[PDB]
């Protein structure tokens, strides 16, 4: 499947793409404002994620640090990034269908649209100003708005027992971005697309 990753933000982002135990495609790249990066994701990929990283410094070996979404200090991510990270999540060719969602379960750093470029399903978006409106206790100094599990590490926020409810913090994210997951047991906002669809992830869509 083809994903075009577009940075419409006014600032540089370092896109990342991983399935948690390996990079997808090159795994990461710098995107200046307006740039587009096209990646190929193997059919059958289960549990892939794309996200943006902000305020990164990398050396010539591709080693460094980012203030949001850092993936063990690498330009080319092999593992998932450190919160806060708005996530585009996908599983492809699962019994004939692709499944896509946006999640705020690991917080929010950059607004995002995640849409098919082929026919037969809808896109999803979280483009509200979550950072600006972030509750004081969830604000990340490096930038972004952490989820409550990351911050407080309780069974209730992290849904460790598999039983948890919405919280004051999850409802913040859900009010601003209803079409994104706000906590682990949120009513799913997954979109079902035809198997082998192609997609575009746009940072700062509005």
Curated annotation (Swiss-Prot):
It is found in: Cytoplasmic vesicle. The keyword Oxidoreductase does not apply. Keywords: Cytoplasmic vesicle, Disulfide bond, Signal, Taste-modifying protein. Pfam families: Thaumatin. The keyword Signal applies. GO terms for cellular component: cytoplasmic vesicle. Disulfide bonds join 9-204, 56-66, 71-77, 121-193, 126-177, 134-145, 149-158, 159-164. It comes from the Eukaryota. Taste-modifying protein; intensely sweet-tasting. It is 100000 times sweeter than sucrose on a molar basis. Belongs to the thaumatin family. This is Thaumatin I. The lineage of its organism: Eukaryota, Viridiplantae, Streptophyta, Embryophyta, Tracheophyta.
């Amino acid at each position: 499947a083809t994903f075009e990753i577009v940075n419409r933000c006014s600032y540089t982002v370092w896109a990342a793409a991983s399935k948690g135990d390996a990079a997808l495609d090159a795994g990461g790249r710098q995107l200046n404002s307006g740039e587009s990066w096209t990646i190929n994701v193997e059919p059958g990929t289960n549990g892939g994620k794309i996200w943006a990283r902000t305020d990164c410094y990398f050396d010539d070996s591709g080693s460094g640090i980012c203030k949001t979404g850092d993936c063990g200090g690498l330009l080319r991510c092999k593992r998932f990034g450190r919160p806060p990270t708005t996530l585009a999540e996908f599983s492809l060719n699962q019994y004939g269908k692709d499944y896509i969602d946006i999640s705020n379960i690991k917080g929010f750093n950059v607004p995002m649209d995640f849409s098919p470029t082929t026919r037969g399903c809808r896109g999803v978006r979280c483009a509200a100003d979550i950072v600006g409106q972030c509750p004081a206790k969830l604000k990340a100094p490096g930038g972004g708005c952490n989820d409550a599990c990351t911050v407080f590490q309780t069974s209730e926020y992290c849904c460790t027992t598999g039983k948890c409810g919405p919280t004051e913090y999850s409802r913040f994210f859900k009010r601003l971005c209803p079409d994104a997951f706000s906590y682990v047991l949120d009513k799913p906002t997954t979109v079902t697309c035809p198997g082998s669809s192609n997609y575009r992830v746009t940072f700062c869509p509005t």
